[PDB]
Amino acid sequence: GAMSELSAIETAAAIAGGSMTALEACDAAIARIEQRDGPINAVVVRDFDRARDAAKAADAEIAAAVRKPLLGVPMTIKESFDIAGLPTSWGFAEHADHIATADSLVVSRLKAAGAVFLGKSNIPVGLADWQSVNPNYGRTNNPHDHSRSAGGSSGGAAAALAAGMVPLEYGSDIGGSIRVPAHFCGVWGLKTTFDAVSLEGHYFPRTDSAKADLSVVGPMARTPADLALALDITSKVPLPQSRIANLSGLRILLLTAHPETVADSATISAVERAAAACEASGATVATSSPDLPDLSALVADYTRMLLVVLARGLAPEGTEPVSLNAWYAMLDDQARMMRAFDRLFESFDAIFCPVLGTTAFAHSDEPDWAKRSLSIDGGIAPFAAQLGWISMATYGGMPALSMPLGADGNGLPINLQIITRNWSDHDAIRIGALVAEALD
């Protein structure tokens, strides 16, 4: 782009080399937020006074010859992550004054690498939407078109990255809440392998309960290099690095259709263009496989588990809740689906497919997804069916990258979803980096 910002790694290098100080990096980011966040409303919790103190402490370490991978790099994090001294509300008015007393694990890891947290980014109520709007902070608007959703639930994070306010962010994903905002705002987002990164401190307000199923946390940035560094900083253990040097020989499964939902022409064309660029770089592309799992059964099973997980096994009055024994059977079903993808990835290195079937939708005041619809090539389509596109990685557990491809006819970003086998998170990042090179 013509107007650019330093990446997270470039900022740390500029501080380590002495071309700028950590306090200057912090003050520059504070200025971008105050200058740009007016019409976007992404950074809704601000901690600028304590951040400047941390930036000064970072410059103290720099002078003492200390070097850390993110030393002095300013960032924000999704509001649902605990930071000691800041509220964690999940957009609930009842929890607006719930102040965390300890940093979450991800925050602690990033701080130990030297990062400076300026504040936290906006979310929908209960993290339960592909928008970012709540009565505590208001609505986040897509920086590419203020009339469209920024995505959710990590939508404030993606908007702050798209507007260049900070180079690094971190979100959570149970129904696409990392991939979808990255796609709506045209930035990079890694849905990580299930259980690869600790959710400690991503607590429902006033509890120490984090989701034990489907949900993952993962980095968001504007470069694949920043994603890989942030992944290595926050992983439970160091994950296998990628040995993929180029696209020659890579085996890609290209999917632009789903038995339970649809993609529009611009999205289909964009995902196809990415596969063709890899084919021109020596990769092999298939458009079907007998080992592809039953995507229709997958979305139905994923949805039943998702609803149970979201309700904590509570049923509406009158109806009978799912029994614990039935829950154990559901996990067996999921494990069986995970192994089906294992077999698929014996033949393929990656699946290429849409993140969602269309670009960022107009702001919706309808809280019930069953009462929402979407425009696909001027045609009306069901909203909730779009869950099919993100269900594979969430239910199967695979890592999935959301990376910029381009924009549609209205300038709204379109991202590609790159799905690789469990624990190959660095492959997903690396393939995305190679795809971006192949497109330029």
Q: Do 259 and 170 fall within a single domain?
A: no
Residue entry with tokens 């991939």 = 179
- Between the CA of residue 308 and those of 89, 176, 360, what are the distances in Å? 22, 17, 28
Domain count, the chain: 2
CA–CA distances in Å: residue 230 to residues 9, 113, 142, 180: 10, 9, 24, 19
- CA 428 to chain CA centroid, Å, is 13
Residues in the chain: 440
Q: Say yes or no: 174 and 268 in one domain.
A: no
Tokens representing 379 are 């045609």
* Method for this entry: X-ray
Quote the CA–CA distance of 414 and 94 in Å, as a whole number.
Answer: 36
* Lookup: tokens for 162: 């798209």
**Burial degree of 184 (CB within 10 A; 0-12, 13-18, 19+):** buried
Report the alpha-carbon distance of residue 333 to residue 336 in Å, rounded: 5
In a domain, 243, yes or no: no
Cβ distance 82 to 102 under 8 Å? Answer: yes
The widest CA-to-CA distance across the chain, in whole angstroms, is: 66
Place of tokens 């030393």: 71
Query: For this experimental structure, what is the resolution in angstroms?
Result: 2.2
**155 within some domain:** yes
Q: In angstroms, rounded to a whole number, what is the distance separating the alpha carbons of residues 139 and 147?
A: 11
Cα 274 to chain centroid, rounded: 20
Task: Say if residues 55 and 26 touch (Cβ distance below 8 Å).
Answer: yes
Give the residues across from 250 on adjacent strands: none
Q: Are residues 313 and 424 in the same domain?
A: yes
In a domain, 209, yes or no: no
Residues 118 and 26 in one domain: yes
CA distance 154 to 170: 8
Question: What whole-number distance in Å separates Cα of residue 323 and Cα of residue 135?
Answer: 35
Query: Cis bond leading into 209, ω under 30°?
Result: no
Closest by Cα among 111, 299, 91 to 204 = 91
- Per the listing, tokens 């003492």 go with 64
Joined together, the tokens standing for residue 240 give: 């296998």
CA distance 392 to 40: 31
- Give the domain extent around 289: 251-439
Phi-psi region of 114 (alpha: psi -120 to 50; beta: other; left: phi over 0): left
DSSP string, 245-271: -SSTT-EEEE---BTTB---HHHHHHH
Q: What's the CA gap between 5 and 185, in Å, rounded?
A: 16
DSSP state of 197: B
| Alpha-carbon gap, residue 186 to 162, rounded angstroms | 7
Task: Kindly state the DSSP code that residue 87 receives in the 8-state scheme.
Answer: B
238 CB-side CA count, 13 A: 4
- Residues annotated as part of the active site: 78, 153, 177
Whichever domain contains 435, its CATH number is 3.90.1300.10
DSSP state of 361: P
- Decide if 241 is inside a domain: no
